[PDB]
Design an enzyme around this catalytic site. Structure first.
Site, PDB file in Angstrom:
ATOM      1  N   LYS C   1      -5.880   1.901   1.951  1.00  0.00           N
ATOM      2  CA  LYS C   1      -4.657   2.173   2.869  1.00  0.00           C
ATOM      3  C   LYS C   1      -3.654   3.178   2.037  1.00  0.00           C
ATOM      4  O   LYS C   1      -4.137   3.959   1.378  1.00  0.00           O
ATOM      5  CB  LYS C   1      -3.785   0.833   3.229  1.00  0.00           C
ATOM      6  CG  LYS C   1      -4.263  -0.176   4.280  1.00  0.00           C
ATOM      7  CD  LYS C   1      -3.521  -1.006   4.620  1.00  0.00           C
ATOM      8  CE  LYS C   1      -4.230  -1.884   5.852  1.00  0.00           C
ATOM      9  NZ  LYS C   1      -5.261  -2.570   5.644  1.00  0.00           N
ATOM     10  N   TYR C   2      -2.503   3.051   2.258  1.00  0.00           N
ATOM     11  CA  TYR C   2      -1.323   4.014   1.840  1.00  0.00           C
ATOM     12  C   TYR C   2      -0.488   3.128   0.734  1.00  0.00           C
ATOM     13  O   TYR C   2      -0.268   3.491  -0.372  1.00  0.00           O
ATOM     14  CB  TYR C   2      -0.530   4.693   2.872  1.00  0.00           C
ATOM     15  CG  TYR C   2       0.729   5.301   2.239  1.00  0.00           C
ATOM     16  CD1 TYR C   2       0.785   6.489   1.520  1.00  0.00           C
ATOM     17  CD2 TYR C   2       2.011   4.694   2.355  1.00  0.00           C
ATOM     18  CE1 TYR C   2       1.978   6.882   1.027  1.00  0.00           C
ATOM     19  CE2 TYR C   2       3.179   5.054   1.910  1.00  0.00           C
ATOM     20  CZ  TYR C   2       3.101   6.397   1.273  1.00  0.00           C
ATOM     21  OH  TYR C   2       4.241   6.911   0.927  1.00  0.00           O
ATOM     22  N   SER C   3      -0.003   1.908   1.179  1.00  0.00           N
ATOM     23  CA  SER C   3       0.830   1.208   0.253  1.00  0.00           C
ATOM     24  C   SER C   3       0.034   0.452  -0.775  1.00  0.00           C
ATOM     25  O   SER C   3       0.770  -0.145  -1.573  1.00  0.00           O
ATOM     26  CB  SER C   3       1.584   0.406   1.419  1.00  0.00           C
ATOM     27  OG  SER C   3       1.007  -0.746   1.581  1.00  0.00           O
ATOM     28  N   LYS C 130      -0.945  -5.477  -1.874  1.00  0.00           N
ATOM     29  CA  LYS C 130      -2.182  -5.135  -1.148  1.00  0.00           C
ATOM     30  C   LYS C 130      -2.643  -4.110  -2.241  1.00  0.00           C
ATOM     31  O   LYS C 130      -1.809  -3.134  -2.840  1.00  0.00           O
ATOM     32  CB  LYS C 130      -2.167  -4.571   0.204  1.00  0.00           C
ATOM     33  CG  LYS C 130      -3.239  -3.967   0.648  1.00  0.00           C
ATOM     34  CD  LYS C 130      -3.079  -3.579   2.126  1.00  0.00           C
ATOM     35  CE  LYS C 130      -2.580  -4.705   3.057  1.00  0.00           C
ATOM     36  NZ  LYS C 130      -3.702  -5.662   3.528  1.00  0.00           N
ATOM     37  N   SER C 132      -5.812  -1.105  -3.261  1.00  0.00           N
ATOM     38  CA  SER C 132      -6.513  -0.054  -2.916  1.00  0.00           C
ATOM     39  C   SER C 132      -7.910   0.003  -3.568  1.00  0.00           C
ATOM     40  O   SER C 132      -8.776  -0.722  -2.964  1.00  0.00           O
ATOM     41  CB  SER C 132      -6.144   1.157  -3.147  1.00  0.00           C
ATOM     42  OG  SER C 132      -4.760   1.085  -2.239  1.00  0.00           O
TER      43      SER C 132
END
Ligand SMILES: O=P(O)(O)O[C@H]1[C@H](OP(=O)(O)O)[C@H](OP(=O)(O)O)[C@H](OP(=O)(O)O)[C@@H](OP(=O)(O)O)[C@H]1OP(=O)(O)O
Lengths: 359, 564, 496
Positions: C1-3, C130, C132
Site C-alpha cells: 500500500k502507501y502507509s 501495516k 509493505s
DNA sequence: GCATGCTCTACTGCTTCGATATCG
DNA sequence: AAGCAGTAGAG
DNA sequence: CTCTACTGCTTCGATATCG
DNA sequence: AAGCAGTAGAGCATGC
C-alpha cells in the site's frame, strides 16, 4: 454514562471530575480525548445546574480557560471547536452571575464565527462549528436576552443567521445545522419579533416544509419552531389589527386550505387546527363576530370526527389533543357561550379522558 | 534613479463618438492610461507623471500664441502621482466635442522637460501620446520636431486605436483591425507618423506604434521606462589559474507582491494599538510560561529530539568559503535534460561591460561550447551565506548579444524515482485507429503557430510569454476600487483580463467539429460530487373567515368562461 | 500500500564460527555483520525513519523471546530506529565487543532453525502497523546447518514455506566460510557455485543518508477540453529540492517540547483579540485601503482548479531559457473518470508524432491565479531488466509572464578569432566528463546529517562529509597540461 | 409515535508542499 | 550579510 | 576649496511560519 | 491546503 445512570449522587465527586476534564483538555493532544472531556464537562454542568456546587466550579475561571482557546484557535480541529462553543454558551445558561461582564464578548465571538462560517465565498462551511455556535447562542440567549426593542442590531443579525440556517437545501444529509436553527427558533422566537412579522410568508413555507421530513428529531424540532412562530405572530397581530389584516387573511386562508384538503396525514391537519384556533384573538378584534362562527364549526368538526360518527378503530383519536387545545383556545375569546354546544363539548373532553391510555 | 512621463490623451470630437460594434476609443485610451498609472502609483515608484490633453475646450500652456498651440490644457506637471490623478482619469476626464491639432501636441509637450526639469537631474524622458489622426495638422514644425528631441534626448511612443494589420470582445489576439477601421485622414496621419518615425531613427522606430487592444495585453507602456537590474560580479574560473571576470544578471525571476497586507484592528483602523506575543508554555497541568532563554533548538533523530544549540549550529556546519562560479566540467548537450532544472531563477552571465579581453575570452568559450554541441557544469555560490549549488551553463549565441545562461541542477537528494505503469504496452487502454484519427484531427485543428508567407518563420498566435500577470491587474484594480468608492463590495473581473487569457476565436470556433467528435467517440463517466461549493452559495437562497343552483347562477351572471 | 512500512529482521548466526577469524589483521564475521547492521540503522534513521527494524541472535545460550524457546535472543523488537538502539548495538563492536558479548549473551549453543524462523514470524505478527515488505536478513557463515540431522532440515524447509506463505522473504548474507560457501546444500530451497565474502555486504556498508518519500500525487485535477470532455490526471513531482528538517524548541533543563502559543491583543486594555475584529490595510502615502481577511483572498480567485486546454503548439517556441518553476509530471488517473487513460494515451501518442505540445491554464489550488503551462509529451525509456528511467506522460513546464522576465543593459558584441575558438575547443575537450544525473550531493544537508549523527551518538567529533561539488584545482591543472598560459597569452594581452 | 443492522459519509491524523512574512 | 551611491572628515 | 566614510537603502538568500 | 488511510456513527431501510 455513569453520570447519566447516577445523577446528583455524584455530587461529592463532581469538582474532581471537573478538574480532571479541564486537565485532560489542556494536556491531551488527540481530538478523540478532548471531545469526551468536553462532553463530560457539559453533562456535568447540565446535571449539577441548580445546586451549591456551582460556586465550587469556578465558572468565571472556566470562561477564561475556554475563551483563551478562541484566540489561540490555531487549528482546534472542528469537532472540538463545536464543543467549546457549546460549553461557552452553557456557562451563560447555568450560573449567569459569574458571567455578567463577559456576555457581550461571547455574543461577539458567536456572531463573528457565524459570520465567518456562513457569509464566506472562499471555502466550504464547517458544519460542526455551525451547529456548535447555534447551540451556544441558544444557551446564551437564556438569561442574556437580546430582543428587538433593547438593541435591534444584534437581534436582526441573530435572526438572519437563523433564517440562513433553517433554509431547505435539495440533496441534503446531515441535519444538525437545520435542527440547531429550528431549536433556537423554537426557544427564542419571542426575542426577534419585528424580524418575524415581515419575513412571515417565507418562514411559514419553510417551517411547513420541514415538518414533513423523514427524521424524527428534525421533524419534532420543526413542529416546535412552527408552533412558536404561529404563537408569536398571532400575539403580534392581536395587538395591532388595523395594519395586519392581510397577514391574518393569509394565515386563515392557509389553515382553511389545509383543513379542507384530504391530504391531512395528521401532522399537517393537527397544526392547521392548532393554528386555526390560535388565530382567534385577532379575529375577535378584527370582526368581533367571527369567534362565534369558530367554535360552532370547530365543535361540529370535533363531533363529526370522533364523537358520534362511530368511526373508531383507526388512527382517529391521535389528533384529539390538538382539536381539544384548539377549542380551548377559541373558547377564551368567545363571550356568551351558546349553551347549545356545551353538552357536546363536555362529552368531547370526557371522551378525551376515556381515550387516554391509547397514547 | 528615476524617470519622467508626460501623457498626451486624445479628447477630440471623433475620439468619443463612434461606438459601432466595439468599445469607444477615448474610453479605450482611458483603460490603457489607467493601466499605466495604477502600476506606477501602486508600485511606490519615484517617477514624474504629467497629464496633458488635446481637444479641450479650455487651454493653458506656456506659449499659446495664435491658433497654433490651442485647445490644450496641461492637467498636472512633473510630480509624484497621488490617487487624485487616479480618480480624475475616470471622473474629472470628460470627452470633448472639439477636433484639435495632433502634431502640435508633441511640440507643446516638448517644453515641459526644459521648463519644469530645470534643475533636477533625471535619467529617462518619455512622452506617451494617445491619438486618433483625424485633424488637419500644421506641417510647419517638420524638421524642428525631429532635430529638437534628438538634440535634447527625448523618447517617444505613439498609440493608435488600430495597429498595422469573432466579434470584437476587446482583442484576444484575433482581429486587431476590422473591415473598415481607418479613415483617409487616418491613412494620411498614419503615413506621416510611419515616415517621420523611420526618418527619425532608422528601422526601429516602427516597433513603437501600438494599438490600444494589443497594448492592453502587453508591457509596452513600461518598455522604455523599466530600470536596469543590478550586476553580480565574480570570476569564472575553469581551473586553479584561469580567471574570467564575469557579470551575471537575473533573466527570469517570478515577480511577486512586495507590499504586504498589514493587520490593523477593526473599529480603530490603526496597526499600532494591537500587538501580538508568542509565549512558550509547558505541557504540565497549568501551563507555565517560560522565557526565551530557557529554550534551545533541537532536531528529530528517529524517535527522540536531540539538543543542538545555535552556537554549536553555527560552529559545526558547512562553510561555503565565499562566492564562486567555478567549472567542474563540460559534459555535452542532451545529458542535461530540460526536466531536471531546479532553481527559482535564470542567470545570464556577461563579462564586465568594460573588458575587451574578458569579452573575447568569454566569446571564445561560448563559441567553443556552441560548436561542440556541449554545455558546461558550474558550482555557483552567491556569497558566503548562500548554499553552494551546481547547474548548467549552456550557450546562447545571438546577433545582438552573447552570454552564458545558468540554470540550477538537482542534487541526489532532490530526485524522486516514482515508477509508473506503461501506457504503450498496455492492453485495454490501447486506442482504436478511428479514435487515433479523431485526436489527430483535434490536434491539427487546434494549432497556435501559423507560418506566414515567408520561408521558415513561425510567428505564433496567442503568445503566452508576453502577457502580463493578471494577478497584479486584478490587485491594482481592486485596490483602486476600494480607495475610490470605499463602501461597495469587490467588483467583478475586467473583461479584457479574460480576453487576454483566452485563445482567439479563429482557433476557438474552428475546432468545434473535432471536439464534438471525440465527445461521442471517447466514453467518459465521472462519479464524484461536492466540488467547489462555498458557504455563500449554500447559505444564500434568496438571490372575514365566514366567507372562508343559485351559486352557479351567480357564476353565470357576473363574469365567467365558456358556457355550458 | 502507501502507509505500509518496511520491516526488516537482522538474523545473525552468533553461534561458534564467527569469533576466531583466520587472519587477525582482518575483521571477524560477527564484527562484519554488526558493522553492517549498524550502518543500515544509521542510514535508515534519516533516510526513512518510519520503517521498522529488529535484530535477533540465535546460537546463543540465554534467550529472551516471547515463547521462551531455547537459544533465541531478541535484542530489539520491531520498532522505529533510534539513537539508543544504535548505542546498544555499539557494545558488540571490534575485538573487544566479542568479550562484552560473551558474558551477557551466550555462544556455541545447539539451536533449531525452525524455532528461529518461528520467532521471526512472531516478531512480524506482533506488529500493529501495516507492513509493505517483510524481510529477514540472515547473517550466517556456515552453509548446511543441522548437518547431523534431517528432521531439523525438513522442519526448517517446512517453516520457510510457512514464512513465504504469509509474505515474508528471507535472504542470506553469507559470510566467508574458508572452503567456499556452497549455496546448494541448504540455502537454495529455504530462500526465495563456491563463493567468497558477498556482493551485498560491501554496498550495504555504504551509508547513503538521503530522505526518500513515497509516491503521493500532490494534486488530482480534471483536464477539461472545452467544458464537456474532462479527464482526470494526477500532478506528480519528480524533482523537489530536499530541505533540512526544521528544529524543535526544547526546554533546556528537561529537553522537552514547549507548546508555542501566539495570540493577538490590543495594547489599550490588554484584552484577548479574536480573528473577527481585525482587518487588513495598506498605506500608500496618505490613502489607506482597508479590506477584510475574507476580501483579501477574493482578489486572487480567477478560475476553478484544474487544467483548461487552450490549443497546441510546436516545441520550437518553447525556449530553453524560459524557466521559472521546477516542472511537474501529469499522468492519467482512471478512477475519477472512466476512459481517462484511453483519451490520455490517444492524445499522448498523437502529440508524440509531431513536436506539438498542449497549452493550458494551470490552477492547482482553489483561490490561486492561473499560470500558462506547457504540457510537453514524453515517451518512455526502458531496458530489458525492466528499469525505466522516464515514465510516460506529459511534463508540465511553467512559462513566465511578461513581468517575470527582465531586461539586460547594452553589451558590445566582441567576437573571437577562430584561432581563439579552436584553442578554447581544445580546453573544453580536455576537461570533458559524463554528467549522469545524481553524481553530485548537497554538502550543507550532508554535513547536517553528519553533525546530527555525531551529536546524537556522541561519538568523538563530527565526521566531515568529503565535499563533492568543489572543483579539483590540481587535477584540472594537470589535465589542462601547459595550455592555459599560452591560451591567455593568445587571447589576453601580456600584462596584469 | 420502536428496534436492529448496514452502508457510507464525514471527520481526524499524518505528511508534504507551497505561499507568505522575516531575518543576517 | 553585501554592496554602490548621495553627502560629510581630511591640510 | 577636491579626495575617501557614514548612512541609506536596497537586495537577496536562507529561515521560519501557516493553509 | 490537499492526499491518503482509517474509523465511527448518522441516517435510513426494514420488519409481516
Ligand atoms: O521585445 P520583443 O519585441 O518582444 O522581441 C523579442 C525579444 O527581443 P529583444 O531582446 O531585442 O527585446 C526577445 O528577447 P528578450 O528581450 O525577451 O529577452 C527575443 O526572444 P528571446 O527571449 O528568446 O531571446 C526575440 O526573439 P528572436 O530571438 O527570434 O529575435 C523577440 O521575440 P519575438 O520577435 O518573437 O517577439
Amino acid at each position: 454514562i455513569f453520570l447519566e445512570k447516577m445523577g446528583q449522587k455524584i455530587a461529592p465527586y463532581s469538582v474532581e471530575i471537573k478538574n480532571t476534564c479541564t486537565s485532560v483538555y489542556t494536556k491531551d493532544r488527540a481530538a478523540k480525548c478532548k471531545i469526551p472531556a468536553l462532553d463530560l464537562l457539559i453533562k456535568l454542568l447540565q446535571t449539577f445546574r441548580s445546586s451549591r456546587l456551582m460556586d465550587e466550579f469556578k465558572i468565571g475561571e472556566l470562561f477564561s480557560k475556554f475563551y483563551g482557546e478562541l484566540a489561540l484557535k490555531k487549528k482546534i480541529p472542528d469537532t472540538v471547536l463545536e464543543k467549546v462553543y457549546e460549553l461557552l454558551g452553557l456557562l451563560g445558561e447555568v450560573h449567569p452571575s459569574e458571567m455578567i461582564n463577559n456576555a457581550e464578548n461571547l455574543f461577539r465571538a458567536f456572531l463573528g464565527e457565524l459570520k465567518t462560517q456562513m457569509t464566506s465565498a472562499v471555502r466550504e462551511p464547517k458544519l460542526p462549528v455551525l451547529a456548535g455556535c447555534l447551540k451556544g447562542l441558544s444557551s446564551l440567549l437564556c438569561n442574556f436576552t437580546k430582543s428587538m426593542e433593547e438593541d435591534p442590531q444584534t437581534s436582526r443579525e441573530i435572526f438572519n443567521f437563523v433564517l440562513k440556517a433553517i433554509r431547505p437545501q435539495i440533496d441534503l444529509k446531515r441535519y444538525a445545522v437545520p435542527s440547531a436553527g429550528l431549536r433556537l427558533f423554537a426557544l427564542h422566537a419571542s426575542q426577534f419579533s419585528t424580524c418575524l412579522l415581515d419575513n412571515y410568508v417565507s418562514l411559514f413555507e419553510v417551517l411547513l416544509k420541514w415538518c414533513a421530513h423523514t427524521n424524527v428529531e428534525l421533524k419534532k424540532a420543526a413542529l416546535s419552531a412552527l408552533e412558536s412562530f404561529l404563537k408569536q405572530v398571532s400575539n403580534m397581530v392581536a395587538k395591532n389589527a388595523e395594519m395586519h389584516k392581510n397577514k391574518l387573511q393569509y394565515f386563515m386562508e392557509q389553515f382553511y386550505g389545509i383543513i379542507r384538503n384530504v391530504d391531512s396525514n395528521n401532522k399537517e391537519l393537527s397544526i392547521a387546527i392548532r393554528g386555526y384556533g390560535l388565530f382567534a384573538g385577532p379575529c375577535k378584534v378584527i370582526n368581533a363576530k367571527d369567534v362565534d362562527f369558530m367554535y360552532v364549526e370547530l365543535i361540529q368538526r370535533c363531533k363529526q370526527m370522533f364523537l358520534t360518527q362511530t368511526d373508531t378503530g383507526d388512527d382517529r383519536v391521535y389528533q384529539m389533543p390538538s382539536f381539544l387545545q384548539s377549542v380551548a383556545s377559541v373558547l377564551l375569546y368567545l363571550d356568551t357561550v351558546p349553551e347549545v354546544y356545551t353538552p357536546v363539548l363536555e362529552h368531547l373532553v370526557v371522551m378525551q379522558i376515556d381515550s387516554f391510555p391509547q397514547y | 534613479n528615476k524617470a519622467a512621463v508626460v501623457l498626451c490623451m486624445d479628447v477630440g470630437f471623433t475620439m468619443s463618438n463612434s461606438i459601432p460594434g466595439i468599445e469607444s476609443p477615448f474610453e479605450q485610451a482611458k483603460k490603457v492610461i489607467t493601466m499605466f498609472v495604477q502600476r506606477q502609483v501602486f508600485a511606490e515608484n519615484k517617477d514624474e507623471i504629467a497629464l496633458v490633453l488635446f481637444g479641450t475646450d479650455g487651454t493653458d500652456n506656456p506659449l499659446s500664441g495664435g491658433d497654433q498651440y490651442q485647445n490644450i490644457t496641461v492637467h498636472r506637471h512633473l510630480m509624484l502621482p497621488d490617487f487624485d490623478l487616479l480618480e480624475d482619469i475616470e471622473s474629472k476626464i470628460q470627452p470633448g466635442s472639439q477636433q484639435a491639432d495632433f502634431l502640435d501636441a508633441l511640440i507643446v509637450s516638448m517644453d515641459v522637460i526644459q521648463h519644469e526639469t530645470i534643475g533636477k537631474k533625471f535619467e529617462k524622458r518619455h512622452i506617451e501620446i494617445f491619438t486618433d489622426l483625424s485633424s488637419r495638422f500644421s506641417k510647419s514644425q517638420l524638421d524642428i520636431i525631429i532635430h529638437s528631441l534628438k538634440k535634447c534626448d527625448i523618447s517617444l511612443q505613439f498609440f493608435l486605436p488600430f495597429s498595422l494589420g469573432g466579434p470584437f470582445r476587446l482583442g484576444g489576439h484575433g482581429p486587431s483591425f476590422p473591415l473598415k477601421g481607418i479613415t483617409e485622414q487616418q491613412k494620411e496621419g498614419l503615413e506621416i507618423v510611419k515616415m517621420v518615425m523611420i526618418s527619425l531613427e532608422g528601422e526601429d522606430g516602427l516597433d513603437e506604434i501600438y494599438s490600444f487592444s494589443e497594448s492592453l495585453r502587453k508591457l509596452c507602456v513600461f518598455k522604455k521606462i523599466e530600470r536596469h537590474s543590478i550586476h553580480w560580479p565574480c570570476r569564472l574560473t575553469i581551473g586553479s589559474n584561469l580567471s574570467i571576470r564575469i557579470a551575471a544578471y537575473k533573466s527570469i525571476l517570478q515577480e511577486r507582491v512586495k507590499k504586504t497586507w498589514t493587520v490593523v484592528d477593526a473599529k480603530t483602523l490603526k496597526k499600532e494599538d494591537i500587538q501580538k506575543e508568542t509565549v512558550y508554555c509547558l505541557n504540565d497541568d497549568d501551563e507555565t510560561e517560560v522565557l526565551k532563554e530557557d529554550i534551545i533548538q533541537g532536531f528529530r533523530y528517529g524517535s527522540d529530539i536531540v539538543p543542538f544549540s545555535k552556537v554549536d549550529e553555527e560552529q559545526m556546519k558547512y562553510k561555503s568559503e565565499g562566492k564562486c562560479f567555478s567549472v567542474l566540467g563540460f559534459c555535452k548537450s542532451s545529458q542535461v535534460q530540460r526536466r531536471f532544472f531546479m532553481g527559482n531563477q535564470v542567470l545570464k552571465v556577461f563579462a564586465a561591460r568594460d573588458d575587451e579581453a574578458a569579452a573575447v575570452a568569454l566569446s571564445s568559450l561560448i563559441h567553443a561550447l556552441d560548436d561542440l554541441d556541449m554545455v558546461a557544469i558550474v558550482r555557483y555560490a552567491y556569497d558566503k551565506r548562500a548554499n553552494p549549488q551546481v547547474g548548467v551553463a549552456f550557450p546562447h549565441i545571438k546577433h545582438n548579444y552573447e552570454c552564458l545562461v545558468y540554470v540550477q541542477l538537482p542534487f541526489m537528494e532532490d530526485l524522486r524515482q516514482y515508477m509508473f505503469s506503461s501506457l504503450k504496452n498496455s492492453k485495454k487502454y490501447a486506442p482504436t485507429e478511428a479514435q487515433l484519427n479523431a485526436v489527430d484531427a483535434l490536434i491539427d485543428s487546434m494549432s497556435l503557430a501559423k507560418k506566414d508567407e515567408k520561408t521558415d518563420t513561425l510567428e505564433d498566435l496567442f503568445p503566452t510569454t508576453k502577457i502580463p500577470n493578471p494577478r497584479f491587474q486584478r490587485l491594482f484594480q481592486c485596490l483602486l476600487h476600494r480607495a475610490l468608492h470605499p463602501r461597495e463590495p469587490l467588483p467583478p473581473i475586467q473583461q479584457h483580463i479574460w480576453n487576454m487569457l483566452n485563445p482567439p476565436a479563429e482557433v476557438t470556433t474552428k475546432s468545434q467539429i473535432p471536439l464534438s467528435k471525440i465527445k461521442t467517440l471517447f466514453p467518459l463517466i465521472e462519479a464524484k460530487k461536492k466540488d467547489q461549493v462555498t458557504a455563500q452559495e449554500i447559505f444564500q437562497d434568496n438571490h372575514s373567515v365566514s366567507s372562508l343552483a343559485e351559486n352557479f347562477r351567480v357564476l353565470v351572471k357576473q363574469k365567467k368562461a365558456s358556457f355550458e | 500500500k502507501y502507509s505500509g512500512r518496511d520491516s526488516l529482521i537482522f538474523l545473525v548466526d552468533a553461534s561458534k564460527a564467527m569469533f576466531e577469524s583466520q587472519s587477525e589483521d582482518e575483521l571477524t564475521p560477527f564484527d562484519m555483520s554488526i558493522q553492517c547492521i549498524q550502518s543500515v540503522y544509521i542510514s535508515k534513521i534519516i533516510s526513512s525513519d518510519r520503517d521498522l527494524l529488529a535484530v535477533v541472535f540465535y546460537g546463543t545460550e540465554k534467550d529472551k523471546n516471547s515463547v521462551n524457546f531455547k537459544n533465541i535472543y531478541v535484542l530489539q523488537e520491531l520498532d522505529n530506529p533510534g539513537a539508543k538502539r544504535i548505542l546498544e548495538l555499539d557494545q558488540f563492536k571490534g575485538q573487544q565487543g566479542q568479550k562484552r558479548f560473551q558474558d551477557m549473551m551466550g555462544h556455541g549453543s545447539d539451536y533449531s532453525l525452525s524455532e528461529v524462523l518461528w520467532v521471526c514470524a512472531n516478531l512480524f505478527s506482533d506488529v500493529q502497523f501495516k507492513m509493505s515488505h517483510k524481510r529477514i536478513m540472515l547473517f550466517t557463515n556456515e552453509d548446511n546447518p543441522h548437518g547431523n540431522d534431517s528432521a531439523k532440515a525438513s522442519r526448517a524447509r517446512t517453516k520457510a514455506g510457512d514464512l513465504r506463505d504469509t509474505g515474508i522473504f528471507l535472504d542470506l548474507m553469507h559470510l566467508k566460510k574458508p572452503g567456499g560457501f556452497d549455496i546448494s546444500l541448504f540455502y537454495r530451497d529455504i530462500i526465495s557455485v563456491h563463493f567468497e565474502e558477498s556482493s551485498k555486504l560491501e554496498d550495504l556498508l555504504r551509508k547513503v543518508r538521503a530522505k526518500e518519500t513515497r509516491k503521493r500525487a500532490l494534486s488530482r485535477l480534471k483536464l477539461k477540453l472545452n467544458k464537456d470532455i474532462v479527464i482526470s490526471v494526477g500532478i506528480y513531482n519528480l524533482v523537489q529540492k530536499a530541505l533540512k528538517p526544521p528544529p524543535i524548541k526544547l526546554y533546556r533543563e528537561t529537553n522537552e517540547p514547549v507548546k508555542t502559543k501566539t495570540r493577538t491583543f490590543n495594547t489599550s486594555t490588554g484584552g484577548l483579540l479574536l480573528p473577527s475584529d481585525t482587518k487588513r490595510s495598506q498605506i500608500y502615502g496618505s490613502r489607506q485601503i482597508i479590506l477584510e481577511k475574507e476580501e483579501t483572498e477574493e482578489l486572487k480567485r480567477f478560475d476553478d482548479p484544474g487544467l483548461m486546454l487552450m490549443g497546441f503548439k510546436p516545441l520550437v517556441l518553447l525556449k530553453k531559457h524560459h524557466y521559472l518553476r521546477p516542472s511537474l509530471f501529469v499522468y492519467p488517473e482512471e478512477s475519477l473518470v472512466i476512459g481517462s487513460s484511453t483519451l490520455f494515451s490517444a492524445l499522448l501518442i498523437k502529440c508524440l508524432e509531431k513536436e506539438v505540445a498542449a497549452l493550458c491554464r494551470y490552477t492547482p489550488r482553489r483561490n490561486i491565479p492561473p499560470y500558462f503551462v506547457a504540457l510537453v509529451p514524453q515517451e518512455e525509456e526502458l531496458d530489458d531488466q525492466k528499469i525505466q528511467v522516464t515514465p510516460p506522460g506529459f511534463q508540465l513546464v511553467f512559462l513566465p509572464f511578461a513581468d517575470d522576465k527582465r531586461k539586460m543593459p547594452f553589451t558590445e558584441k566582441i567576437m573571437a578569432t577562430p584561432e581563439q575558438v579552436g584553442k578554447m575547443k581544445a580546453i573544453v575537450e580536455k576537461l570533458r566528463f559524463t554528467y549522469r544525473s545524481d553524481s553530485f550531493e548537497n554538502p550543507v544537508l550532508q554535513q547536517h546529517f553528519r553533525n546530527l549523527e555525531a551529536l546524537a551518538l556522541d561519538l568523538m567529533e563530527p565526521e566531515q562529509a568529503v565535499d563533492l561539488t568543489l572543483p579539483k584545482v590540481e587535477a584540472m591543472n594537470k589535465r589542462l597540461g601547459s595550455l592555459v598560459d599560452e591560451f591567455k597569452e593568445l587571447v589576453y594581452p601580456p600584462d596584469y
